């Protein structure tokens, strides 16, 4: 099960960025899928999550400004980040968000998220 994540990079404070996870449709169309993020000095955090029929929850630190979707092909998770703050520096990881089980038993390369001057 691949789990590949893009879409990070450098931005300053009040930037934006667009997060993809690219997953076989077996796994996003059937799961609740969310996005994590790890910083430094910090352990790992749900901050989104979408379920298998579309319903979507934020971690309250980012309500108003990071959006969950998926394409249509199911193929596809975003994660869309806008209004970033330092706060938000993290390697940012896609993976199932199961209420009951949690993620899969593995984790991807992640993608890299800065927000500095
Ligand atoms: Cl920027
Ligand atoms: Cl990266």
């Known amino acids: 099960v691949q789990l590949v994540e893009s879409g990070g990079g450098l931005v300053q404070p009040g930037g934006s960025l667009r997060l993809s996870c690219a997953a076989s449709?077996?796994?996003?169309?059937?799961?609740?899928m969310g996005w994590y993020r790890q910083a430094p000095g910090k352990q790992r955090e749900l901050v989104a999550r979408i379920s298998s029929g579309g319903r979507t929850t934020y971690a309250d630190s980012v309500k108003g400004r990071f959006t969950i979707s998926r394409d249509n092909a199911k193929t596809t998770v975003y994660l869309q980040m806008n209004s970033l703050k330092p706060e938000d520096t993290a390697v940012y990881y896609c993976?199932?968000?199961?209420?009951?089980?949690?993620?899969?038993?593995?984790w991807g390369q992640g993608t890299q998220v800065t927000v500095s001057s």
């Open positions: 449709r077996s796994i996003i169309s059937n799961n609740a």
């Open positions: 993976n199932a968000a199961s209420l009951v089980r949690g993620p899969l038993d593995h």
